[PDB]
């Protein structure tokens, strides 16, 4: 009668359908622990994420709703693919946990970052990453949380983006970015509390690319004031026109910082960190550097877009319209707009999403 068995994985208990066998842990984050499993019906490995009592408070609820809604919309080879959504509880009153089942990838990007990548692999991985982002951007979705723990790869050299809990739909209203633990990849506009467009995500690609080359985090900060200082030290105090856009108190503190000059991008990414220079006229160290100097730009109105990035010669060698000009996700009549509902109401919203589609 009972279609669920309950595995123990350290602290947390997974109660999952019988079809998913031999669960084992593969990763973790703010939302708990992720397991690999064998799906006896599809006869392949999958990934299984558990959201426990996500309706328990505001920030967990908004994050879960966004995840469910957007996992159902996305459809692209470089976005993690949704496979199943279920909950073991049988009614709304009893509802506790949501389980998301996804295709299984071999590792997240933190593993790749320590090793030395040649130019072919470095540019191909970024291209795939940019294609994933363009797909989100082609329906107005801004991810806001790109970072290496949110990108996964397979040993066949494919790459997929995941974790849309912070993703935002389109709108002309300011939305404060939710708190997160790993903040090293946030763009200046997010740090400083300014309005922002989709190429906040491009700044994050900039940090990731710098890391794949440095094998070290570009802007490590205990604090936000710490983090801003790392940015200006390395890139330089921004132009006075960029200072006007700031609110007064944020403005006074940023203008009172010591005026750093910033280093060149040759001084920031010398040939030594880059592999042997290809004979291919586009996969140069000088081209990867050029692309970095256009992504790692403090003032977003001066910063390259995802589309221009895909046309850049370091990336452009792999260009295929079936990947970079693919059909968008279909964003339903639901606003992921950081509104507030109460505990009782979030519970219904999240339950309906699990049971409907």
């Amino acid at each position: 009668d009972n279609n669920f068995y309950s595995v123990e994985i350290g602290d947390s208990t997974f109660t999952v359908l019988k079809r998913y066998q031999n669960l084992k842990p593969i990763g973790s984050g703010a939302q708990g622990i992720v397991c690999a499993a064998y799906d006896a019906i599809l006869e392949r490995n999958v990934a299984i994420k558990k959201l426990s009592r996500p309706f328990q408070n505001q920030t967990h609820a908004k994050r879960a709703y966004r995840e469910l809604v957007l996992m159902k919309c996305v459809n692209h080879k470089n976005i993690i693919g949704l496979l199943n959504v279920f909950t073991p509880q049988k009614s709304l009153e009893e509802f506790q946990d949501v389980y998301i089942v996804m295709e299984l990838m071999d590792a997240n990007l933190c593993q790749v970052i320590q090793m030395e990548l040649d130019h072919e692999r470095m540019s191909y991985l970024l291209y795939q990453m940019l294609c994933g982002i363009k797909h989100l951007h082609s329906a107005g979705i801004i991810h806001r949380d790109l970072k290496p723990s949110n990108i996964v790869v397979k040993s066949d050299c494919t790459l997929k983006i995941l974790d849309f809990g912070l993703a935002r739909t389109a709108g002309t209203s300011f939305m404060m970015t939710p708190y997160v633990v790993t903040r090293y990849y946030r763009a200046p506009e997010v740090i400083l509390g300014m309005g922002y467009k989709e190429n906040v995500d491009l700044w994050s690609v900039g940090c990731i690319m710098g890391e794949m080359v440095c094998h070290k985090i570009l802007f490590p900060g205990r604090d936000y004031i710490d983090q801003w200082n790392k940015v200006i030290e390395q890139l330089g105090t921004p132009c006075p026109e960029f200072m006007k856009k700031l609110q007064p108190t944020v403005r006074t503190y940023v203008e009172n910082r010591p005026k750093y000059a910033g280093y060149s991008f040759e001084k920031l990414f010398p040939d030594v960190l880059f592999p042997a220079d290809s004979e291919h006229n586009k996969l140069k160290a000088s081209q990867a550097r050029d692309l970095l100097s256009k992504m790692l730009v403090i003032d977003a109105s001066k910063r390259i877009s995802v589309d221009e990035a895909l046309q850049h010669p370091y990336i452009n060698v792999w260009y295929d319209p079936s990947e970079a000009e693919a059909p968008p996700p279909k964003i339903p009549d639901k606003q992921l707009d950081e509104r507030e509902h109460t505990i009782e109401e979030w519970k219904e919203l999240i339950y309906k999403e699990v049971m409907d589609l």
Partner: peptide, 23 residues
């Protein structure tokens, strides 16, 4: 046009939202 890579080795061989809540 160069062939896309098909293999990638994964193992080596060798409280506060913005900078305004702190001030």
């Amino acid at each position: 046009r160069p062939k896309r890579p098909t293999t990638l080795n994964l193992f080596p061989q060798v409280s506060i939202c913005l900078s305004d809540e702190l001030p």
